[PDB]
Structure formats: structure tokens, C-alpha cells
Design a protein around this ligand. Structure first.
Ligand SMILES: *C[C@@H](*)[C@H]1/C(=C/c2[nH]c(/C=C3N=C(/C=C4\NC(=O)C(CC)=C4C)C(C)=C\3CCC(=O)O)c(CCC(=O)O)c2C)NC(=O)[C@@H]1C
Ligand SMILES: *C[C@@H](*)[C@H]1/C(=C/c2[nH]c(/C=C3N=C(/C=C4\NC(=O)C(CC)=C4C)C(C)=C\3CCC(=O)O)c(CCC(=O)O)c2C)NC(=O)[C@@H]1C
Ligand SMILES: *[C@H](C)[C@H]1/C(=C/c2[nH]c(/C=C3N=C(/C=C4\NC(=O)C(CC)=C4C)C(C)=C\3CCC(=O)O)c(CCC(=O)O)c2C)NC(=O)[C@@H]1C
Ligand SMILES: *[C@H](C)[C@H]1/C(=C/c2[nH]c(/C=C3N=C(/C=C4\NC(=O)C(CC)=C4C)C(C)=C\3CCC(=O)O)c(CCC(=O)O)c2C)NC(=O)[C@@H]1C
Ligand SMILES: *[C@H](C)[C@H]1/C(=C/c2[nH]c(/C=C3N=C(/C=C4\NC(=O)C(CC)=C4C)C(C)=C\3CCC(=O)O)c(CCC(=O)O)c2C)NC(=O)[C@@H]1C
Ligand SMILES: *[C@H](C)[C@H]1/C(=C/c2[nH]c(/C=C3N=C(/C=C4\NC(=O)C(CC)=C4C)C(C)=C\3CCC(=O)O)c(CCC(=O)O)c2C)NC(=O)[C@@H]1C
Ligand SMILES: *[C@H](C)[C@H]1/C(=C/c2[nH]c(/C=C3N=C(/C=C4\NC(=O)C(CC)=C4C)C(C)=C\3CCC(=O)O)c(CCC(=O)O)c2C)NC(=O)[C@@H]1C
Lengths: 160, 161, 48, 68, 160, 161, 161, 161, 160, 160, 160
């Protein structure tokens, strides 16, 4: 989170926190209830977001559910949806945290090697995340939709 | 390391759960005291040297520690002792800002006891100095963040002893 | 002997610093013949 | 924030190193402003000479933008 | 400033701006007008603040204005109040910037060596800055006074 | 680096007077341009890969350069060129958010021509790719940020050529 | 522990060599000074309590140590401190008799620094008391055994400090 | 250990002072609430097993703790957790009766954090159980001694966490 | 104190407090005001008691204040009266605590060793304590006189 | 000492003692008799030197012994004289050792931090050392006065 | 107090209280809680205010604590600080009463004659009182600070 970033940098340079860092902490604590409300809305709509995200991903890339597809089969598609739920939970974590350290330590570092191990299309996973971005922003006001969109776009950029 | 928010996130990630109501109250409880922590941290950062000077005057100097044969005899050892006091004050401020003693466990307490045992440093006198610094900081910051500052000084003292 | 139950008789300093030692030592090391201004302000305040 | 772009040669005259002692005896490399003094003092201490130094990165005004 | 700090932090990691980093910039640009008002207020009240800070400093520390003091005479006292004016200008620059990068690059790095060479009491200069903060606090609103006092306390801590 | 606020600060610092009404107007203008700047940067960061894809498809692939005897030939060279393209996009976004091309000069534009001539990399094709990213961002982002985006995009091309 | 004779014997045993002229010279070197050590030890044993009394009078009591707040305050701590003085005197006597500080290393100074730090005892005051006892013992025994007695008190003081 | 009365006596003994108005006020303040503490201790002693049962049912069981992989899984671990809960309740009662957390510092918290870290016991779950016992005890004892009992449960929870 | 021993033996047997120990606690808390009154009275009568006990001791055993005496000379009698003051303070502490635990920890364990080292007569100090007991009991009512005399006679017995 | 500075220097090259180093060690052992005599002469007059140096220092810098002075009061003045005695002892150690190695580790490294923490005037302490140098050179012949004063000037330069 | 002054005029003119007097009584009783808070705050900071006032007074003019000074010596400085404590108590009384009749009747009428008899510097006493005002106003909010400063300026003007 923002607190972890500021404290880590201050400790690394061996100094007290700067006024700019204190100001960013003040803004972060000010935006806390709004972030919590956005995360509550997303976690309440977690299943619908996942379902239409899967529908958009399957419409865009039917080859993945084709015989030579990584998610060919009902249980393979169930695993794809479970990864989708995992990434939605990570997005909610990042939204409440205010930055991307939890999302980074949980779901991007090594994700390239893991999905290479599983022979899964990383661009397909990114497209599914984009579908989630659309479905989630469809349930939120403009400012909060943009705030969630920042983390969704961060996930898409990280899976790259 | 981890603050309160990241601690809650890891505590739910280990169970594979979305944030629930109770996690929401924990996050809200931290968020309610954000400003007081920042104000007290700014006060401590502005009055760092005075706090160390008053704590040393109250608890360390005019003692055997400053007399020949003492542990903080000689200018080098005096500078080292005041440097250790500044270390403790800075990490107490970091822990107070983060709302979690994980940074204290990771960056201060691990192996400090054995290092002090090897060097012959008086851990009891060090903890007394930390307590004097706690008293001075509680005086400066005021009732608003006095207890919240004092918990991490007590944490450091208990971990050292 | 033959009636007394065994009981803890000695401690290592590492163990003794665990029971006590929390909140350190409040005594302040005193020295014989040291020069110290401690208590002079309090005495002056009481005299006033 | 700025890196000086310099070239120099430094001869070792106490040990006669005996494997590929050529890349470490004549080099151009970008060195930061904060580390340029300690980098350049080493050449003078060893005995080599600096052939040229260049600002490259930063502006002559300094003031804001110096820190990094 | 905040923008240069966020950009440098992103560039070091070789990645795009994290959502919390964008939120920091958005908050700063939204709050810039209050900082501008602080800057204009301190600018139009620059001379009164300097005069009252000089009076408070000379009352607190008579030793600086004394037979053996660093500032004895007229030109010495003129230079001291001039240095107070420089630090007031730096405080205004920091307030408008939202961080302490310009203040650091202009007036604190090397100030210890400079004042040791000149044999000027660094605690005396810190007392002068504290008196400046006390004067400036009497010409602003409470939130605005706290915002200025953050940078004043930063200068006080930096001269330590 | 020097953003708009830091640039005005330096402009007044070298002359040694306080902030003026003109400085207030400039800072107010940059504050007004803040929100659309952040939105455009977010959109570009979201669609970074797509921009490179269209720019390559428009000016880079299917040509002589994407065949044997080309600088783009071999996967390593093509990856190096696309990484340079991502560098241009990222530093253009940084300069767009900052308001000043100091980052574009020192971190990107500084050098980048002697190295290209030494390597043998074509420069006209690189400028064409930079302009290709220019029309791609022109469609991806709204017309509010189109002109300021285009000016920093043209800055890299002018420095390279 | 070990003495001069056993030290020579073990030093030749670990290398498996027989008693040579050199070890013989060390052996008669110890044997020549046997009577002086015995006389000094008898004098010290006869005047044990008076030495501790005078050392305490010169270095510890009649000060803030025996007042409230001092470590010597209360009958329990007074008795413990004079017991410690008796410890130091007795082990110095054993070391002087054996002509080797190995007994001091094995049974006095091991862990003593950490034990005193844990208990809160003033190590500087203890070293001052040991020095006063050394001065009194050197006065009593005379030049014949003054240096031999003083070297082990100095060893104890250097180990503690 | 020490209670309020012995704490005041030691605090004045270290200064070498007779009991004055302030010390008498502190002693009177303790003596005024003597009967309430005894009544609360009797109530807690009579309801000891029921308090542990409700605290476990509210904070520990019916979760992952009592399932396979849980720390309190298996009968031995369940009995261990309930015995630890009983120890915490009993020492909380002792501390409430004595009006001082010194017994908690000496006989419970010493090395408990490190012991739980070595054994893998979840300190967060232990703190949750302690707070559940605190809620039940506050329900039972009533407004008279609720805060007095609760401060020592908070002391134990803060010492563990 | 009584609370200390009750809690201590209950913990040692690993049990809650017995109703007999609760009855002890109830009686001890009930008698608290009377104990505080007795301690207060001795506190304000501390100097008269010490002076009269010193006079009685020097009359009964004149040899102690004599040239080979341990307390010969004005300073050695000042130290003797200071010791008597210390023991009166310890007696007041014991009266407030309810049993002679503080007296034991502060002035009985090791008293034989310390006074043998100082070469002071234990029977003389015991006689001084008895004189203090008489003077103190002459200033109290009967029940309070007996209550204080219990601790005074404990001190006399322990110094033996 | 000279022996330590010479032997360890010829140990960093894995060679025996230099034929250039089987010299000034030689002059050191030759002049050790004079060094011991000078150290003894300074040691005998330690109290007079300290007293006169403190007198001269308090005349030349009377602000320290004023109410706003660090050394205001009888015991704060006693501490200042104790520090002067400490530095005289360190000077004698340096004279006997023949090098400022021992005095450097004992009372120079970190002295700036210690005196800044205590808020003491380092220029005042340096002037006190200069007064001690004058009083010491007043008691010695010219060669020995120069030899002692050379170490005194080392202390003055280091405290700077 | 204001009640006394209103009743005195009413009895002098032989009439009941006027409506204006009743209104001032009402406002006077309305302001009571803030007045009591100010008096409580000053009463709790008695020792610190007195000690700091003495320190500032002796810094500003140390001649009074010089050998030829009126307040030379420990027992003489104690009386000066006791006089400052007296005037602080009088100021608290004045604040609680609402005006300066207690201050007049207790501490200013004849103060010139008493201090002339004792040969103490009344200008020094005035500066000592002013330092007490500064320390007191350092511990109060602005409105309460001005309210206490009124009485402090009354004392300063009266001792003139
Ligand atoms: C109030 C000062 C007390 C004191 C301290 C003392 N410390 C040392 C030496 C060291 N202190 C440290 C400390 C740390 N290492 C860490 O990682 C941290 C936290 C991040 C700390 C606080 C270390 C590593 C050393 C050893 C290296 C060194 O010598 O500098 C000394 C010097 C001991 C000596 O001379 O050998 C002292 C005196 N001494 C007291 O008496 C005070 C109670
Ligand atoms: C000429 C006197 C100047 C002066 C001195 C001053 N010193 C102190 C306090 C201390 N000084 C020391 C010094 C040392 N410790 C060491 O190990 C060495 C090396 C041998 C030195 C020099 C220490 C440790 C203290 C702390 C107290 C103590 O000794 O226990 C003070 C007191 C300051 C206070 O606030 O109490 C003074 C005044 N002051 C002057 O004005 C002179 C220039
Ligand atoms: C020998 C036939 C002639 C000669 C030579 C000479 N050379 C040096 C010093 C250097 N020689 C090298 C060489 C190399 N560096 C490389 O990387 C390679 C290939 C991998 C080579 C061959 C370099 C770089 C140096 C400088 C650094 C160093 O000293 O190692 C000297 C010493 C010069 C001096 O004293 O500084 C000499 C004498 N001298 C003759 O007379 C011959 C004609
Ligand atoms: C075929 C089995 C798979 C497949 C391939 C595919 N490739 C392209 C386009 C290009 N492929 C290359 C390849 C290389 N460049 C190099 O330097 C090397 C190393 C020798 C290689 C292999 C390039 C450069 C292109 C771009 C066009 C050009 O060459 O100028 C396409 C077309 C993509 C498009 O968008 O039109 C395709 C489809 N497709 C499959 O389904 C197979 C898995
Ligand atoms: C891309 C549009 C064109 C192209 C490029 C190309 N570049 C390289 C190699 C390098 N490019 C860089 C660039 C930078 N280094 C920096 O630090 C920065 C700014 C932060 C830049 C812009 C450098 C230094 C290299 C060399 C090291 C490396 O390869 O990473 C290559 C590879 C050349 C080779 O094989 O050695 C290529 C092909 N080529 C085209 O055809 C495009 C038009
Ligand atoms: C119960 C709510 C939680 C829990 C506990 C748990 N503890 C152990 C084992 C031990 N607990 C102790 C405790 C103490 N020693 C002391 O001196 C004190 C204070 C006086 C305490 C509280 C110790 C020493 C042990 C180790 C020895 C032993 O097992 O008896 C276990 C057993 C672990 C194992 O099987 O090895 C457990 C389960 N577990 C939970 O899930 C709760 C959060
Ligand atoms: C007086 C009635 C008798 C007497 C006493 C006497 N005492 C001393 C010296 C000391 N007495 C103490 C006592 C205590 N220290 C403690 O902690 C306690 C417990 C509260 C006690 C009672 C101590 C420490 C000393 C040593 C000096 C000091 O206090 O610093 C003397 C002086 C002996 C000497 O050799 O100087 C005397 C004479 N003498 C009598 O004749 C009376 C019977």
C-alpha cells in the first residue's frame, strides 16, 4: 500500500518521511471510505462480473474453447473462471490497498512462467481481464469506475 | 513488512476470501486515525534531537555508563549510544505510522539481543532509555497520539528484554 | 531431604531478564561520588 | 540527475595482472554526478589520466532538477 | 515535486504509472489552488513575517546579537534577516511544488558545511525558522496554517 | 527532470525574486489541465500494446525491413525495436504528465542518434513509427489531450532526426 | 583450572615431548617464588575482612550508592555486594597461589558481565572496589608479593571492564 | 510480583520517603474498590468453565481452526488450547485482584510470544479468544467491575500482539 | 502484602483463591483506613520518636557513644539516628502493607552481615528499636498501640 | 603508537619489517626516555594546569558561565573542569605513545556528535585546550614545550 | 469583582441596581466557565511557568544574580521566584474575579515603597513578570491568551 511504499523508501534512504509523502498518506486516508465502498460493490457483484467476463472472453477467443484450446472442456473452463475470480479478488485487494504491492506479490511475479507451464494464452487472460474491466465499470459511477479501471489496466499491462 | 491494511489483505489472501464486513471494520478503524498519526509523526521528526537529548539526560548520563569503565565511556561509544537511540526513535515512528510492529520485528529486534550480548551492551539501560524517550514523546505529541506512540515503544522494550 | 518437594532454586540471567526486565530498569545507575544534577530542580521547587 | 560521459586510461603498476588486462585499462563510461568525483579520483590515484569529460545529461543551470 | 517524484519512481521500475500514483497526481492537481493561495499570502506578507521572526529570534537567543556573536553590528544582522527571507522564499516554493525537491536542491544540501564554514549557529537558524513558522501561523486559516506548518517543520527538521 | 512547477521555480530561482502573478497564472493553467492529462495517460497505459501493434502494422511490418537483409530482421532485433517503441510511448506519457520535455531530452533524446548510426538502425523508419504511435494515440485518447500528446510525440521525432 | 606446574606438564603433553631444559627453567622459576606466595596468601587470609571493610569505605559506602536509588541500598544488596568483594579477594588469592589466571577465566569472569548487566549492578563501581582491594592488599603484603598480587587484580579489572 | 499497595511502597522506598498525601490517596483509591474486585473474582471463579465454553464457541470452533490443517485440530491440541484459555482467565483474575499487571508480566507473558512463534500457534486467534473471554466476563460481572476486569484482558491481548 | 501472599500461594498450588483467603482479603481491605491512620500518626511523629529513642538508647548503653564506640562523635550519632529513621519508615511501610514483607525485603535480610562488616552492635540497634517502640506506643490508642507494637517486636526479634 | 603504526603497515604487504622501518621505531625507543619524563612532568602538575586553563577560558569566553551558558552552575563548571582534565590525560597518553592514535580513539571520534547532543560550544572547548597548552608550555623547557604543544595543537585542530 | 463594584455604586447612590448593571452581571456570569478554564490551566502550569520566567529573567539581566546583585545566592533566588509565584497567583485571582481589584488590594498599592525599602530593582521585577506573561500565553489559545495578557499588562503597567 501507499503506507508501505512511503515507509520503505524512507527506511531505504534512512530518513524520516518527507512532507510530500505525508501529504500522499493524508490523501490516501481521506480516500479510504470511497475505496472501501468501491471494493464492497465489486465483491457484492463478484459472480456476475466473472460470468459476463467469461462470456466476453469466449466470444472474442472461441479458439481457447476449441479442441486445441487450453481451456477445452467444462473443467478447463471452470479453471479459467476460477483464475478469473482470483484476479477479481486481487483487483479488490489492490483497490482497498491504494497501490499494487499486494497484486504484484500475489498474481503477476512469475505469472508468465506459470502460464507458460500451463500452456495458456496470456493475451487471452488479458482479454478476459479487460472484459472484467468493462463489466465492473458498468456497475460503478464514473470516478469510481475510473479508479477500478486503473487497477484493471495495471493487471493487463503486467500480464504482458 | 506490512501495515494494518496489508496485514488484513494477507490475512484474507491466505484463506482465499474476499473482504468481508469485519475486514471492512478493521480497515475503517485504521482509516479513522490516519491524520493523528501523520501529525504526531511530523512532530517527532521535527523534535527528534531534543527528544534524544532529554531522554539521555534523564536516563543515561550522570551515571556509571559515562564514567571510565562504563559502557558509553569515550566519545565513540557515546556517539554509538545516541545513534542507537536515534535508530529506535526512527523505527518507532515508522511502526506508529504503519500501525503494525512487523517492521520492528524485521528490522530491529531480530538478532539485536544477541548482538548486544556479544558486545556487552546493557540491555536494561537501553530499555530504560527507550522508556524515557517514550515519556518525552508522549509529552510532545499530546493525548491524541500519546498511547498510539507508546504501544510501539513498549513493543520495542519488551522485544529487547 | 525426604519431605520437601523439589522447587526452582536458580535462574540463568537470560531467564531472569525475561521475567523482570520488561520496561527495563528504572533505577538509573548511580556511581559513588559522581557529579549529578538530578533532583536539584525538584529541591529548589520545594524550597520556593 | 546527470551522468558525465568520460574516457580515460588507468595503468596498473604494482601487480602486473596477467589476463585480458585491456578492457580495464582504457574505457568510456557514463558515471553519475554524485559518483563522478570518487570515480575520477581513482584514476589519479592509480596514475592514469582522464582524456575528456562531458556534461551529456544535465543543464548548466542546476538549481532544481539537480537532486535524484 | 510530486509529479517528478512519481515519474522518477515509475521510471526506476521501468513500468507505467500505478493507480495509486495517478491518484496522488490527481489529488495534487485538485489541491493546487489552495497552495497557490498560501503562496500569494506568504508573498504579500513576506516582510512582516521576516521582521517578527527576527524579533523573536533576537529575544530567544541574545548571544547571536552580542560582542562575540556571529551577527554583531548592522550588516551581520542584515544578512541574518536576508537569510530568513531566502528560507521564506524556499518555503513558498515548496508549498507551490507540493513536495520538498526544490527546497532540498536549493537550500539544505550542503547547508551544514556552509554554516560550519561561516561559524553560524545552526540551532540559532532553526530557532529563526521556528519563529518564522509562528509568525506565518497568525496569517492563515487553520487547515492552511497546518499545510504551511508541514513545510516549516520540514525545514526545521532538515536543519538538524 | 523538471516539470512545469519545477521549471517555473527554477526560472524565478535563477533571478532571485518571489513568485509573481504570471507564475500564478501558469501554475493555475497547469492545474486546470491536470485531470484530462491523467485520463489520457491512463488510457495510453491501458492500450500500450495495441498502439505498438497498430504502429507496427502501419509502418513497420510487411515491408522490406521485415524481411531478410533488414535491421528489423531476426526476433531479437524486432524485440529490441518494439522495446524501444515502448520506451518512446512510456517517456512520452511521462513528459505529457509532467508538462516539460526535460525527461524527453535527458532520459530519451540525449544520445539516441550516435548509437543508432553506430548500430545501423534506420532513423526515418523509427520516426515513421513514432508518428504511427501519434495517430494511434490520436484515436485512442480524446481530443482534449490530442494536441499536447502530439507535441511530445513530435518532440522525439524532431530530436532523433 | 590449572597452575604453573600443571600448565607446563599439559603444554608438554599436548605436543608429546619430554620435560626439556626450557620447561625445567620455567619449573624452577615457579619453585623459587613458592614461599613468598604462601606468605602473602596467609597474610591475606588473616586480614580478609579488614581489607573488604577498608575497600568498601574508600570506594563504595558514604555515597549515593548506599542511599535510596543506589544499588547498594538495602541490607540485602549490601550483604550481596560485600559477598561479591569476598569472592573477588578469594579468587585473587587462589590465582596468586597458583601463578595463573586460568582459574579467574574459568570460574570468575565467565558470564559475569552479562549477569551484572541483567541484575543492574554497576560494573564501574565494582571495578573501583576491586582496585581499592588491590591497593589495600598491596599495602599489606609488601613489595615481595605486591606485584604478583596486583597482576591478578588487574586481570580481574580488565576482564570486567 | 506486586500489587497496588506494594507498588506504592516500593515507589516511595526507592526515594527513601515516608508515605505522603499522594501515596495515601492512591492507597485509599485502591481500598475503596476492594470489595468489588473480590465479588468479581468470586463470580469469575464460579463461572470459569462456562466462560471458556462461550469464548471458544464464539471465536475459535466452527472454523478452519478445528478442521484438518487447523492448529487446534486433534483432541490434544483442543485440550491444549482450552488449557491456555483457562490459564489466561485465571491470571487475568489474579491481576484484577492485585490491581497490577506485574504478575502478568512475570508469570505469563515472559517468552510467550516467542513460544507461540516456535510452536506455530496463531497469535491472532489467541487474541480473538482472549477478547471473547473479555466480552463474556464483562457480561457476567456487571458494570461495577467490568472495566476493571477488561483492562487486564486488554493488557494480555496487547502483550501477545 | 496479604494480597501478595494469597495470590502467590494460590498460584503456586495452581488454583483459584480459597474462601478463607478471600476472607483475609476482605478483612485486610476493611482495616485499611485504620492502618492508614496509624501510619499517618507515626509519619508526623517520626522525628520526636527518633529523638526520644536516641536519648533512651544512649542512656541505656552509653558505651556505644564513647571513644571506642561504633557511634562515637557527632557524625557517627547522626548516622545512628538516620538508621533509626530508616527502621521507623520500614515499620510504617509494614503497617500499611499488613504484614512484615516490606520490612524483611528492605531491612532484615543481610542485616547481620552488613552490621558485622560495619562493626556495629546488633543488641544496641535492637535496644534502639525497642525505645522507638515505647515512644511510638505512648502516642497511640491501645488497639493501635498493639498493632504497631506487633511490627516493632517483629523487628526486635528479627534483629537477633 | 609508532610500533603499531609501523608493524601493521608492513603486514598489509606480506613482508617483514622494512629496512626503512628499522629506523624511526629506533628514534622512538631512543626518545622514549624523554617522552616518559615529559609525561611525568605534565602528570605532576595536572591540577594547577587544569585550574589555570579553566580560569583563562572563563575570562576569554565568559558567556559559557552565564545563566544562558552550558556550564552555568557550580557542578556544570565542575564537569567542564573534569573534561579539561580528561583531555590533559589524553594528551599525556599521546605523548607517551608517540602518536595520536590512542587519543584519537579515546576522545576525538564522535566528539562532535557528543557535544552537539549536549549542546556545548566546541569552539569554547577548543579554546580551553589552547589555554591548557599555554599553561603546560609555561612549565617546560623549549624542546619539551614544543613537543607537548604539538599534540595540544593536534587536539585543537581535531576539535574543529 | 464586578458584583462588588456595581453594588458599591448602587449603595452610594442609595438605589437598586440599574438594568445596565444587571446586564453586565449577566454577561459576567456567562463568561465564568471560560474564565475558570483559564485559571485552571494556569494553576496546573504553576511550576513550569515560574521556572521558565526565572530563567528568561536571569538571561535578560544576569546582574541581579551577580555577587553585588539583590538576588545573589540560593536563598535569595528562592525569594525572587517566590515573588513571581505570588504574582502568578494574583493574576489567576484577577482572571477569576474578572478585574483587578484583588490584584490592586494585594500586590501593587505600596509595592513601590516595599521594593524601595528592600532595595530591589522594580524594573527587573517588571521584566520578570513579563517573562511570566510570555510563558503563560505560550500555553493558551488565542482568546484566552489575550484575556490573560490583559491582566499581565495591568501588572506590568502598575509596577511602573
Ligand atoms: C543508548 C546507547 C546504549 C549503548 C549502545 C552501544 N551500541 C554499540 C554498538 C552497536 N550498536 C549496534 C546496533 C544496531 N544494529 C542494528 O541492526 C540495529 C537496529 C537496526 C541497531 C540498533 C551495532 C550493530 C553495534 C556494533 C557496531 C559498532 O560497534 O558500532 C556500542 C559500541 C560498543 C563497542 O564499543 O564495542 C554501544 C556503546 N551503550 C550503552 O551503554 C547504552 C545503553
Ligand atoms: C571546559 C568545559 C566545557 C563544557 C563541558 C561540559 N561537558 C558536559 C558533559 C559531559 N561531557 C562528557 C565528556 C566526555 N566523555 C568521554 O568519554 C570523554 C572523552 C575522555 C569526554 C570528553 C560527558 C560524557 C558528559 C555527560 C555527563 C557525564 O559525564 O556523565 C557538560 C554538562 C552539560 C549538561 O547539560 O549537563 C558540560 C557543561 N561546557 C563548557 O561551556 C565548556 C566549553
Ligand atoms: C613488449 C614486447 C613491449 C612493451 C610493452 C608494455 N606494455 C605495458 C602495458 C600494457 N600492455 C597492455 C596490453 C594488453 N591489454 C589487453 O587487453 C591486451 C590483449 C588482451 C593486451 C596485449 C595494456 C593494456 C597495458 C597497460 C596496463 C598494464 O600495465 O597492465 C607496459 C607497461 C607500461 C607502464 O609501465 O605503464 C609495457 C612496458 N614494452 C616494450 O619495451 C616492448 C616493445
Ligand atoms: C504458423 C505456424 C503460425 C502463425 C504465424 C504468423 N506469423 C505472422 C507474421 C510474421 N511472422 C514473422 C516471423 C519472423 N520474423 C523473423 O525474423 C523470424 C525468425 C526467422 C520469424 C519467424 C514476421 C516478421 C511476421 C510479420 C510479417 C512479415 O514477415 O513482414 C502472421 C501474420 C499476422 C498478421 O497479423 O497478419 C501469422 C499468422 N499463425 C498461426 O496460426 C501459427 C501458430
Ligand atoms: C526500432 C524502431 C528500430 C530498431 C532498433 C534497434 N535497437 C537496437 C539496440 C539498442 N537500442 C538501444 C536503445 C536505448 N538504450 C537506452 O538506454 C535508451 C533510452 C533509455 C534507448 C532508446 C541500445 C542502447 C541498444 C543496444 C543494446 C540492446 O540491443 O538492447 C537493436 C539491436 C541491434 C543489435 O543487434 O545489436 C535494434 C534492431 N531496428 C529497426 O529496424 C527499427 C526501425
Ligand atoms: C488456544 C486458544 C490456542 C492454541 C494453543 C496451543 N498451545 C499449545 C502448547 C503450549 N502452550 C503453552 C503455553 C504457556 N506456557 C506458559 O508458561 C504460559 C503462561 C503461564 C502459557 C500460556 C506452552 C508452553 C506450550 C507447549 C507445551 C505443551 O504443549 O504443553 C498447543 C499445542 C501445540 C502442539 O501440539 O505442539 C496449542 C494448540 N492453539 C490454537 O489454535 C489457539 C489459538
Ligand atoms: C544507631 C542506632 C546504631 C549505629 C549505627 C551506625 N550505622 C552506620 C553506618 C551505616 N548504616 C547503614 C544502614 C543501612 N543501609 C540500608 O540500606 C539500611 C536498611 C534501610 C540500613 C539500616 C549503612 C549503609 C551504613 C554505612 C554508611 C552509609 O550509610 O553510607 C554507622 C557508621 C559506621 C562507620 O564505620 O562509619 C553507625 C555508627 N551505631 C550505634 O552505636 C547504634 C546502635
Amino acid at each position: 500500500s501507499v503506507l508501505t511504499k512511503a515507509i520503505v523508501n524512507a527506511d531505504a534512504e534512512a530518513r524520516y518521511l518527507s512532507p510530500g509523502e505525508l501529504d500522499r498518506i493524508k490523501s490516501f486516508v481521506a480516500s479510504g471510505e470511497r475505496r472501501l465502498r468501491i471494493a464492497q460493490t465489486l465483491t457484492e457483484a463478484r459472480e456476475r462480473i466473472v460470468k459476463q467476463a467469461g462470456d466476453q472472453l469466449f466470444q472474442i477467443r472461441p479458439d481457447v474453447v476449441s479442441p486445441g484450446g487450453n481451456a477445452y472442456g467444462e473443467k478447463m473452463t471452470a479453471l479459467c473462471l476460477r483464475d478469473l475470480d482470483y484476479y477479481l479478488r486481487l483487483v479488490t485487494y489492490g483497490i482497498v490497498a491504494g497501490d499494487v504491492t499486494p497484486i504484484e506479490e500475489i498474481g503477476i511475479i512469475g505469472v508468465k512462467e506459470m502460464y507458460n507451464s500451463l500452456q495458456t494464452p496470456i493475451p487471452a487472460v488479458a482479454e478476459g481481464v479487460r472484459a472484467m474491466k468493462n463489466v465492473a465499470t458498468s456497475l460503478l459511477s464514473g470516478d469510481d469506475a475510473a479508479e477500478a479501471g486503473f487497477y484493471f489496466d495495471y493487471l493487463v499491462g503486467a500480464m504482458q | 513488512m506490512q501495515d494494518a491494511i496489508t496485514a488484513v489483505i494477507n490475512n484474507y489472501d491466505v484463506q482465499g476470501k474476499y473482504l468481508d464486513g469485519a475486514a471492512l471494520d478493521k480497515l475503517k478503524a485504521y482509516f479513522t486515525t490516519g491524520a493523528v498519526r501523520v501529525r504526531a509523526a511530523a512532530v517527532i521528526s521535527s523534535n527528534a534531537t531534543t527528544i534524544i537529548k532529554e531522554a539521555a539526560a534523564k536516563a543515561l548520563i550522570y551515571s556509571d555508563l559515562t564514567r571510565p569503565g562504563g559502557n558509553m565511556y569515550t566519545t565513540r561509544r557515546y556517539a554509538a549510544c545516541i545513534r542507537d537511540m536515534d535508530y529506535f526513535l526512527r523505527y518507532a515512528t515508522y511502526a506508529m505510522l504503519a500501525g503494525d510492529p512487523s517492521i520492528l520485528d524485521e528490522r530491529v529486534l531480530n538478532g539485536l539481543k544477541e548482538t548486544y550480548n556479544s558486545l556487552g551492551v546493557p540491555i536494561a539501560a537501553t530499555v530504560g532509555g527507550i522508556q524515557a524517550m517514550k515519556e518525552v514523546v508522549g509529552g510532545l505529541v499530546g493525548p491524541d497520539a500519546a498511547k498510539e506512540a507508546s504501544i510501539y515503544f513498549d513493543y520495542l522494550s519488551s522485544g529487547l528484554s | 531431604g525426604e519431605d520437601v518437594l523439589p522447587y526452582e532454586r536458580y535462574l540463568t540471567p537470560a531467564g531472569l531478564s525475561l521475567r523482570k526486565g520488561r520496561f527495563g530498569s528504572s533505577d538509573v545507575l548511580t556511581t559513588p561520588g559522581g557529579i549529578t544534577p538530578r533532583g536539584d530542580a525538584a529541591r529548589m521547587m520545594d524550597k520556593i | 540527475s546527470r551522468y558525465f560521459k568520460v574516457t580515460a586510461c588507468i595503468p596498473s603498476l604494482k601487480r602486473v595482472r596477467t589476463g585480458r588486462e585491456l578492457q580495464n585499462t582504457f574505457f568510456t563510461k557514463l558515471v553519475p554526478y554524485e559518483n563522478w568525483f570518487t570515480e575520477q579520483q581513482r584514476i589519479q590515484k592509480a596514475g592514469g589520466k582522464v582524456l575528456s569529460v562531458k556534461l551529456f545529461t544535465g543543464v548548466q543551470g542546476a538549481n532544481t532538477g539537480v537532486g535524484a
